[PDB]
UniProtKB/TrEMBL annotation, chains A, H, I, J, K, L:
NCBIfam families: phgtail_TP901_1. This is Major tail protein. InterPro entries: Phage_69_Orf23_MTP (IPR022345), Phgtail_TP901_1 (IPR011855). It comes from the Viruses. Pfam families: Phage_tail_2 (PF06199).
């Protein structure tokens, strides 16, 4: 009972004191939290001791002229830049003394892969896989004004005919 | 109660702000909104997916000598230029200060198809299919030359 | 023995509790229940799978000046708002205290399609397809304005 | 030589042993047996696979006031309840002690579809498709109320 | 120059050597041979594959009281028993000692489909499709009861 | 300006050099050449692939007593023997020493389908589809028996 | 207002610069431009892909004795030679120094299909489908022999 | 002759003394019991000695707004929390002095994997793979009231027209 | 020229003195007899010495309410119980002084895998892979009365209308 | 320009002095001759020296009641019996003083794999992979009378109506 | 909002002082920037230290008669010639004092793979995978006149009838 | 802008002084030039030193009665015979004092694989993979008369009716 369009992605470069940057035009998306069971089994029983996680998140996108962000992702991949990213679900606001904040999943890592593709008379898309350093942290997050105005994204409001407006 | 010929239909390219025109000699005009909803099953119940809606309109008209508009359409379908159109119902004016402009639906998209047809001893007829490209807005619009 | 025009058909948005209306100038109305049962074979025999049933109803009607309801429908198909409808058979009242309300079928779902059509020197006709979204309930319902 | 209207057609739910009824105002009734045999080729020859046979019957009838059976059918297609039906040819009685009961075919399955239809100034017609779910048995069956 | 009704058409089960019969009240009868040849391309040229040929025949006829054969057919399509059939053209006798037997085509296969149909105030009609299962042999065959 | 019945159409098996014949009682005859060209897109432009062309011809004719040729055709489609055919237009002779032979198209291939059909109180009609198997050659050909 | 028979239609092979001709006895002629636009969905919105447009034209005409052009067409579809065609509207001359040449559309491509057809006691008719292979240019062109 | 809808899943966190939690809107489901044959073969015979099992269970789901359970599953995967889960088949009640209890398969472990996915204008689903510590235990289990009332799940009962009810 | 429906599967637990148990509603089926060629090749020739076989049989099924057998299979997989199973082909009876016996393939082993699956409004099926200890043995086998009566499996014989019978 | 139907397969067990046995109702067929290049490359050149081949042949079939041959193949697989097999192409007879003989490819080996499969209301097919000892030998071979009469395989010749014949 | 047709590929052989060479008739295209996380994890934390990248770019093409370039690519693959290549995106010109220059991605390497394919009555295409030495460099690049005139690529301008022009 | 039909394949056995042999009825075709980058990376840079190539060429064909060539290929694969082969593209003749010669790619090796396949009422095709010793050589090659006359391959010229010709 939840449309994915609702979820939103925010990015930022760690040692940069600026507001986040939404990721536009991502078609697919995925977030895998694997686990490796450090289990040691007795000869007369069994036990699990620990777990080494291998979290990660995958996404696609469509490379529109306007934003140069994909270039930043690529520079991160090739230059091994640390990036902090969080998916901040819209339409799930705070409960107690929190209304503009929104549910989230904040995690940091390095972009361990990035790969585009393009065909004739076709939009040129790409796919990035992003690691996750350790465990992620959840917590209600607020959005920056820029992302808020983008979220609206109204399309071609009513214009008029015979030269009143383009 | 509305005679079809009351429905007036205009087009123009987005770039050409000044330009204005109307489609002539319509025989059959048909709008369409097609909702893509295919529920995928669930153990505890079922959910009805909300999919996109590819609305489109198909009209057939005739082709005479004092007009080339249909040629502009068969140009656009190929060059894939953008257009925007106005489905205005006449005899339905504004409410307060918009009386000169009658109710209409405005939508911007491309012409997805052009197909004309000839028949020995008969006037040639051209049909066109136009994809609306998103939500269709409402309001009122003013006609040119009072017709 | 029932003349089709006895079948009365109402719609309204779930949110607008107060709102009420009826469809007018129906020409052909058709309900449908489609059972998806495809047996998959078995060595010892065969089993008939029980699949979902996507019931839907399609109606065509005319479009006149003193009404905009059809416009609300061509709005909903796009905006994909929910609606709920009432297929009430008149001349069939309650049994004990429900006489004013006649038998009907109630079901809530979306409008899956709108397609109108024009024809030179003729009234424009709009057709609509509505998906019922689940089991259709039975009972009796009351008409507005005694008609 | 048999006039179609001689073919009589009954239904009832398996659970309701006592219940009995008949379909009324048939216009077109059609049975069908569809053999799925697709030979897959062989170097030394060819073999004709023996596949299942999904037999089904489709009937259209009218809908009047003194009956709700068709409503039970449009209920079953949704609720996917079992039914069992009798295709009895009248004017064909038993041979020794079964004269009161005429030849018939008996088969139990679900109603796979219901689709009714209206038309301004005309009686509404409902069509149904019933899947037989296996081999159809033969014998003789007795009518109710001598008709 | 041959009136269709000259074509006589017989069936019988392989097991029942003694049994013999004929199809009655044909309205439209049609044989078919369908060659599956799909050339797959080649750099130096092209080769035309020689595929199997699924020949089949479809006939419609009427259904009266003094016959149950059609019921045997609607039995076989389900039970998927083998049959063998004779497409004999009358008025074409042997050449030397086979005059009593007229030219015919003999082929053994299953009945792939049965579909009957009713219509208020009309005789019910049953159609059948029979798959021939291989090469169809030729020669002459003798009719029963001189008709 | 050519009346269809001027088109004369002959067949014969490649092996039987001496054999010659003609098709009789054509009602509708139709040749066809189908080009398979599906451009696959390219970044710098587009290229139109040059694919094979499966030409074929379909003719319907009648079936009388003083001929069995149609039976040879329904034999070939099954046995998948080769044939070769001649689409000769009469009233179009050679130019220098070929006047006795009229223009024609020659092509060798198989008969891809045979389908005859009967109708109570009517002459049975057989249709055939022939695949040409490659380029069709041109030239002039001589008729038998001056007709 | 344009009678169809005003539309004049010429063809010729690219190699044969000198050659020129016209299509004769058209009955129905139809041009078509088909835009392939299938939006693939996006989380933040939707984008309408701009795909290629496979324009093509289909015409049917008659076939007489004093012409072989149609034969050249049924040759090209097979040999897959290039051609180029001119859809010139007569009664529409130039503007300054091009009056002798009337408006026309020029496009070069292959003939994608040829299909002729015969009918006892009637003139044979050949239909052709031509793929335009890219953008269609506009301008004016001169007729041969003043007709 | 058994529709899957009947089977029901119940979860619970081990060190939590509360009633179980149904798992809503699971589309697919699977339960694999692999085995590793600790077999030793003589030079003049053959033998099987033991077997190391690698049981596990996989499931999908659809992430509706109402419940935050998927978040709990995820927290488990990343934090290695032990969970006890059992599928309790409905419509198969107890035989002897047991009517409210239902057939079941009880097992506990750790969630070794969790991974969601989401596309444009599409519901956002996910897939979790859950290990099984050792052998499972079967036994007739009773459901908690909450699960019982959910099981009913009637939909949009008959309302009325012209303002009597929404 | 042989319909698979004809073949029939019989199971039994080894140290149990009872009659076999047919396996109902198996859709697919398979029986792989791999081999490992213990071959030693000279420098001036070649030779095969022996072969280690890895026989096994795979099957699916559909989990109808009536029978609890699938539960027994599962208990085996998890508990490593030795089972003896044979496919006994119907419609191929004995030749010499044997009429009720039927051709067969008898083999013993442990169930090395079992795994079910189920989807919405779908029958819940499963798949099991069963090892084979060593070489199997062929020999005409007789069926137990229970399996014989099941084999008939007639469906909804002719009942009557207007209350004579359900 | 060659229909596969023409090719024919003959089998025989080595230490058996009898005539071959055709393999009926094989749908697919394949014959792979892999190679392993024992190549040694200098530091200033390259060389191929030898090659170890891994030839083999695969086939399917359809298990008709009449013949018990598939059982023999299976016994070979599980018992490691040596089998000599040759594909003898029909319609390619001898050239010089040879007319009844036919072109062929003769090879010996052990059946390294065999595996059947079967579905509901479906014919029960199988697939066998057969090794090849070393290099095969080609040479015109004659067929046994049995195979010759089978090759004809005419179907349901013209019978007669009204009790003259079945 | 970006058609791939816009992007353009330029090639050149390193020790050659000539202008670049566009690559015509490439259908697909791809550019993968993998990464290998040289990460060392403490026993009480985690850390990433470095990253070894494995960039590369893949493309197809269609082998038109006119150009012999594909032959040069092949000679490279087989001869291990160093090539410098850059994708220079059209319709994204310079910003400050730069108008003829275009955005780009310049990288050098060796062609680690090349492979064509061709079917009957089909255009003969090919696929090449090209490594990337280290990190690539971005920077606004200008095109050579040759590529500029090719970019236009107008098709069959208006000719005339009855012998004025071919 | 090049149809594959144009390209032609020529084969020959090395130690045989005869003219080449075309390969008829090949449907598919492929020519892969892999590379293995003998690269050594400093701790403060990177370098490529050499490359070991693994070129090869794959092809299919259709086994027409007329030619016995496929048998020769097979004999090679099994006997490790060295063959020299070159694709000589038609419709690309010599430039300077060369008109009958045609562009080509000459290479020799051993046939490392060969494998046929055949189905019911289907033409019997096969697939061969052929290695390449070292680097190939390109050079304009002339064709042998035999191949030239085959290239024409005209089909069923105009015959005549009523017994004039078959």
């Amino acid at each position: 009972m939840k449309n994915s369009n609702d979820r939103i992605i925010l990015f930022r470069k760690a040692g940069e004191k600026v507001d986040a940057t939404k990721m536009l035009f991502l078609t697919e998306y995925g977030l895998s939290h694997e686990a490796d069971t450090d289990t040691e089994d007795t000869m007369d029983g069994s036990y699990n001791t620990g777990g080494s996680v291998e979290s990660t998140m995958s996404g696609t996108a469509k490379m529109f002229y306007g934003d140069d962000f994909a270039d930043e992702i690529e520079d991160a991949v090739v230059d091994r830049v640390l990036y902090e990213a969080w998916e901040v679900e819209s339409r799930i606001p705070g409960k107690n003394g929190d209304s503009a904040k929104f549910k989230a999943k904040y995690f940091q890592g390095f972009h361990n892969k990035f790969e585009l593709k393009a065909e004739a008379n076709g939009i040129d898309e790409y796919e990035y896989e992003y690691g996750v350093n350790g465990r992620f942290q959840r917590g209600f997050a607020t959005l920056p004004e820029a992302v808020t105005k983008k979220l609206k994204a109204t399309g071609y409001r009513f214009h008029d005919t015979t030269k009143e407006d383009a």
